[PDB]
Amino acid sequence: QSWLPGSQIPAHLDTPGNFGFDPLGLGKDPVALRWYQQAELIHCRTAMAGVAGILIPGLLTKAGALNVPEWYDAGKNSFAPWGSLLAVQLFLCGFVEAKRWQDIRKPGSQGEPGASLKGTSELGYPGGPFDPLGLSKWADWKLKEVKNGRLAMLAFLGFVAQKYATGAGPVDNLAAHLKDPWHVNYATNGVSL
Amino acid sequence: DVMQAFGTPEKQILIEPVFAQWIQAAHGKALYGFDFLLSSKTSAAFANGQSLWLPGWLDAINNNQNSLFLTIGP
Amino acid sequence: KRDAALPSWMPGADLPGYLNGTLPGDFGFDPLYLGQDPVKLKWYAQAELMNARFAMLAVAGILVPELLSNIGFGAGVAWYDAGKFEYFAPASSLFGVQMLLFAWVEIRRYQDFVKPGSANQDPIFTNNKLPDGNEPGYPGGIFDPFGWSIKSLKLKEIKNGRLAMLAFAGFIGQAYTTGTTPLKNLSTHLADPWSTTVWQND
Amino acid sequence: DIAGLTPCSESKAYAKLEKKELKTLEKRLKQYEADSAPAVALKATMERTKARFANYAKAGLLCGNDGLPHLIADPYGHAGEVFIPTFGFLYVAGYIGYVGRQYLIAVKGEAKPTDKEIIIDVPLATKLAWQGAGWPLAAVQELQRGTLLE
Amino acid sequence: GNWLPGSDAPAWLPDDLPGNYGFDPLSLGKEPASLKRFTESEVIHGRWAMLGVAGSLAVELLGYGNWYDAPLWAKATWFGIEVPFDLNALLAFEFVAMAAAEGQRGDGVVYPGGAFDPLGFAKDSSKSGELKLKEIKNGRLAMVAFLGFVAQHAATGKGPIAALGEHLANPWGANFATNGIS
Amino acid sequence: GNWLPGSDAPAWLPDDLPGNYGFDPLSLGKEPASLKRFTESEVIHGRWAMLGVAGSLAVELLGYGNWYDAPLWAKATWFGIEVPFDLNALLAFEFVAMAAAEGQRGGVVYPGGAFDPLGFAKDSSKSGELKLKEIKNGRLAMVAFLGFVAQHAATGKGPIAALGEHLANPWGANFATNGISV
Amino acid sequence: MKDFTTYLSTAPVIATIWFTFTAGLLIEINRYFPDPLVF
Ligand SMILES: CC(/C=C/C=C(C)/C=C/[C@@]12O[C@]1(C)C[C@@H](O)CC2(C)C)=C\C=C\C=C(C)\C=C\C=C(C)\C=C\[C@@]12O[C@]1(C)C[C@@H](O)CC2(C)C
Ligand SMILES: CC1=C(/C=C/C(C)=C/C=C/C(C)=C\C=C\C=C(C)\C=C\C=C(C)\C=C\C2=C(C)CCCC2(C)C)C(C)(C)CCC1
Incomplete structure (x- = not known):
């Protein structure tokens, strides 16, 4: 499984999502590779989530099911202060990410005798209470999880860039193109990239 | 100099000395309008010594025909 | 590497291996190789039956109330414009009760898929049980009350299902373009079939 | 505004600096026909010079009693003046430096290193060149790992 | 009888526990040290929310009022009787009352008795067990x-006994499907 | 139980210290000479600020006083009553009083004798269990008190009044409407 | 030409083939984006 068939995969990937991609050779240090693998995993999970709440809203809005705003304009609305919301969020996440961080340092660390059955599983895959249904011979899930992830990571960067360029919804952009594909492009707008 | 030479002084890199201008403000010069310490009328530092010497002071710092904490630019 | 002497879909071509003629209706069609891993054949084999039996029911639900309503008997409408708003309860509830009664029956069936003899007996009237089938998707007892015991029979199921599944895809497709009932699409086709292909209508 | 200085979008002196420079070039352009070569230059400069003033007024820099745009160097009205560029440098300088580091070390172990400082191994350097794109992620990881210091 | 037909019950739930029908898929009680805790705190949740339900029903059927509209007066009103004090006076003499009596519950018992069984229901012999099932199953239920009482009112509906009434008028009409789906 | 799960507690904090949860990242108590000093000063800061709080709650707790607005009179005013003077007289007879009694610390945590009349410290096996509670009510x-000073500089308000403002509009009035972070 | 290329990869030659590149780049960018005091 290679990302550019012919390119000699760099040694430091002996197949432990590994399609051999690391041109700049970030992960040659196996310290750095374990750290960077969970950056990815976290980056995937958040983005798959986030995008689901950009698309599935955005698609149903055209469908007519839900009268949701566009994702740029879902911030602005009256209930509580944003300072609060961010604070309470920044408070609440900071706690939990610190429980991830100590797991990444000392895998077992989150099972001290003193409310901790959330011990661990393997590194980046905590399971137990994070796996209600419980799924565990077919760990092909592990694969899709990165792939569906990198797809979604790109998708968002796309959203961000493709509103900077056309200033309209992804569910619109998708139509505009589908209506006249050859005159509505990358190539027929503001900036050439 | 090169910008001056080519007749485009508007392209100059002129950094304003914000830090000294801040200090001068804290000392009570009001030109820059930061309103800090001895500039701001609602500061303990002001209210403490306002009936001591600050009237002689503040009067002198803001007379710009004198040398006391001259005006500062790029 | 592939069976020699069993039903093919391109006679002369190669069944791949994993399609042994084991499952019911295997003539060894899997161009994209979706049934490679025998875990995934287990799901799909069942997935097929469920999807099959819903289609075969549904397509009967679709066609018959037209076949009768044209003969003229008493409630008959369009199979899509039918569910609009005309019932003793509201949309919302009829789903809730539907989702409830199923969620039960399906987690029952699912446990039987996961473990072959896990759910075969009544848990209330506990003397009542369906026999030791040992065959998920083909559970039997109540579900075979007139008692058709055969390989013969288990083909005829998936063959009818594959056909029905389509017929329903057609119904989606055919409605979405033409905009009348599928027996009204077949009427207009039968009146002047040659000047009424898809290509004509496209 | 900040340090009491006016914004260039409004200020009079700045808008009178527009006039003087333009009206220097229009006193020249008289001495040439409109079809001529230098007239297309003294028109194009004007167009550019008049565009330039417009593009600081749109940028919203602070112009003083002088009529010249002064700069802001700490915090958020005027980030892009210094605060963003600043990173630009530390990146590209860090890029250059770390490429140069990875070159000298990569040579070090090869009998006579001094030859590679002169007859530079180009295809070594041009591979380190691209590698040096992701340098802060490596630079950090190297400070961690503890191979960074003698 | 265990919670799901088919399933095997885990190693850690001995069924000599009261009401163990083999539910720990998230395996939160795997460690005994952490099981003994939850077996305790299951019973206490069990208890309160039994009174809880019994209490906030009674205020609507008999006592004139509703459990959602009760704190309105933040003059208190018991059965009809204007209760004494106000808010502060209740904080202090509920803090100290609860804090003392719970604070002396730690220094780890589910079925203490002495004071708490004056009549002597549990005691020898067989009966004591059979009650502790009934204790946890009325405890759960x-x-x-109570969560049913918060959910139906939490963001929609009205009053527990009134919502029950509304359902009995129009059962096919008014149920969960009006604000639970959309 | 140490301050950050996982992390190993350093060599220099023996956990026979009262309230050692293994917090000295900056390693300020690395040297035992410098540690013995801080174990002492911790307890004293602990002790004062426990009165400090208890005091400047009780002021505005029942009377229309306030700890920020207390020194206004620089005629003093205890519990509504008048006072025995002014500025110079308090300074002098607070200097000598403090300077003498703190001067005579030829540094101890639990000097006892006079300071434990009622006799709790005594019974070795519980003596430690108090010293935890000492330092934790000490820290808290x-x-x-820092919390009392921080909120004052942001608002005007005053501990029990800020608490009351937060109870009215909790989501509204909290610490993201001042400037610790903008 | 192993020899000719080693000479082309000499210090003074590389420097010059490098500087005409990073000079052009900066002249070029000052053409299509003229007169920057921001970005
Ligand atoms: C693109 C991306 C990562 C890109 C990095 C790349 C290419 C890495 C590749 C390489 O390293 C390798 C492998 C090897 C190296 O040798 C070379 C390079 C090439 C360097 C991450 C994006 C990651 C994207 C993420 C995490 C985005 C998540 C979305 C969220 C949560 C946003 C929130 C909201 O949208 C909601 C949900 C609802 C809205 O209404 C409101 C808001 C608030 C706006
Ligand atoms: C922000 C800002 C500011 C400020 C700043 C500051 C204040 C700073 C400081 C700083 C500091 C305080 C620093 C320190 C440092 C230290 C050290 C110690 C260093 C080191 C270094 C090194 C080690 C390096 C290395 C390398 C690399 C990485 C790459 C290249 C090569 C080399 C080798 C060189 C200002 C206002 C101005 C402006 C605006 C912004």
């Missing part, structure tokens, strides 16, 4: 109901 |   | 107060 009342924890589920 | 030192935090709270």
Whole structure:
């Protein structure tokens, strides 16, 4: 499984999502590779989530099911202060990410005798209470999880860039193109990239 | 100099000395309008010594025909 | 590497291996190789039956109330414009009760898929049980009350299902373009079939 | 505004600096026909010079009693003046430096290193060149790992 | 009888526990040290929310009022009787009352008795067990109901006994499907 | 139980210290000479700020006084009553009083004798269990008093009034409407 | 030409083939984006 068939995969990937991609050779240090693998995993999970709440809203809005705003304009609305919301969020996440961080340092660390059955599983895959249904011979899930992830990571960067360029919804952009594909492009707008 | 030479002084890199201008403000010069310490009328530092010497002071710092904490630019 | 002497879909071509003629209706069609891993054949084999039996029911639900309503008997409408708003309860509830009664029956069936003899007996009237089938998707007892015991029979199921599944895809497709009932699409086709292909209508 | 200085979008002196420079070039352009070569230059400069003033007024820099745009160097009205560029440098300088580091070390172990400082191994350097794109992620990881210091 | 037909019950739930029907898929009680805790705190949740339900029903059927509209007066009103004090006076003499009596419950018992069984229901012999099932199953059922009482009113509906009434008028019409789906 | 799960507690904090949860990242108590000093001063800060809080709650707790607005009179005013003077007289007879009694610390944590009349410290096996509670009510107060100073500089308000403002509009009035972070 | 290329990869030659590149780049960018005091 290679990302550019012919390119000699760099040694430091002996197949432990590994399609051999690391041109700049970030992960040659196996310290750095374990750290960077969970950056990815976290980056995937958040983005798959986030995008689901950009698309599935955005698609149903055209469908007519839900009268949701566009994702740029879902911030602005009256209930509580944003300072609060961010604070309470920044408070609440900071706690939990610190429980991830100590797991990444000392895998077992989150099972001290003193409310901790959330011990661990393997590194980046905590399971137990994070796996209600419980799924565990077919760990092909592990694969899709990165792939569906990198797809979604790109998708968002796309959203961000493709509103900077056309200033309209992804569910619109998708139509505009589908209506006249050859005159509505990358190539027929503001900036050439 | 090169910008001056080519007749485009508007392209100059002129950094304003914000830090000294801040200090001068804290000392009570009001030109820059930061309103800090001895500039701001609602500061303990002001209210403490306002009936001591600050009237002689503040009067002198803001007379710009004198040398006391001259005006500062790029 | 592939069976020699069993039903093919391109006679002369190669069944791949994993399609042994084991499952019911295997003539060894899997161009994209979706049934490679025998875990995934287990799901799909069942997935097929469920999807099959819903289609075969549904397509009967679709066609018959037209076949009768044209003969003229008493409630008959369009199979899509039918569910609009005309019932003793509201949309919302009829789903809730539907989702409830199923969620039960399906987690029952699912446990039987996961473990072959896990759910075969009544848990209330506990003397009542369906026999030791040992065959998920083909559970039997109540579900075979007139008692058709055969390989013969288990083909005829998936063959009818594959056909029905389509017929329903057609119904989606055919409605979405033409905009009348599928027996009204077949009427207009039968009146002047040659000047009424898809290509004509496209 | 900040340090009491006016914004260039409004200020009079700045808008009178527009006039003087333009009206220097229009006193020249008289001495040439409109079809001529230098007239297309003294028109194009004007167009550019008049565009330039417009593009600081749109940028919203602070112009003083002088009529010249002064700069802001700490915090958020005027980030892009210094605060963003600043990173630009530390990146590209860090890029250059770390490429140069990875070159000298990569040579070090090869009998006579001094030859590679002169007859530079180009295809070594041009591979380190691209590698040096992701340098802060490596630079950090190297400070961690503890191979960074003698 | 275990919670799901088919399933095997885990190693850690001995069924000599009261009401163990083999539910720990998230395996939160794997460690005994952490099981003994939850077996305790299951019973206490069990208890309160039994009174809880019993209490906030009574205020609507008999006592004139509703459990959602009760704190309105933040003059208190018991059965009809204007209760004494106000808010502060209740904080202090509920803090100290609860804090003392719970604070002396730690220094780890589910079924203490002495004071708490004056009549002597549990005691020798067989009966004591059979009650502790009934203790946890009325305990659960009342924890589920209370969440039913918050859920139906939490963001929609009205009053527990009134919502029950509304359902009895129009059962096919008014149920969960009006604000639970959309 | 140490301050950050996982992390190993350093060599220099023996956990026979009262309230050692293994917090010295900056390693300020690395040297035992410098540690013995801080174990002492911790307890004292602990002790004062426990009165400090208890005091400047009680002021505005029942009377229309306030700890920020207390020194206004620089005629003093205890519990509504008048006072025995002014500025110079308090300074002098607070200097000598403090300077003498703190001067005579030829540094101890639990000097006892005079300071434990009622006789709790005594019974070795519980003596430690108090010293935890000592330092934890010690710390919790030192935090709270900083909390009393921090909120004052942001608003005007005053501990029990800020608490009352937060109870009215909790989501509204909290610490993201001042400037610790903008 | 192993020899000719080693000479082309000499210090003074590389420097010049490098500087005409990073000079052009900066002249070029000052053409299509003229007169920057921001970005
Ligand atoms: C693109 C991306 C990562 C890109 C990095 C790349 C290419 C890495 C590749 C390489 O390293 C390798 C492998 C090897 C190296 O040798 C070379 C390079 C090439 C360097 C991450 C994006 C990651 C994207 C993420 C995490 C985005 C998540 C979305 C969220 C949560 C946003 C929130 C909201 O949208 C909601 C949900 C609802 C809205 O209404 C409101 C808001 C608030 C706006
Ligand atoms: C922000 C800002 C500011 C400020 C700043 C500051 C204040 C700073 C400081 C700083 C500091 C305080 C620093 C320190 C440092 C230290 C050290 C110690 C260093 C080191 C270094 C090194 C080690 C390096 C290395 C390398 C690399 C990485 C790459 C290249 C090569 C080399 C080798 C060189 C200002 C206002 C101005 C402006 C605006 C912004």
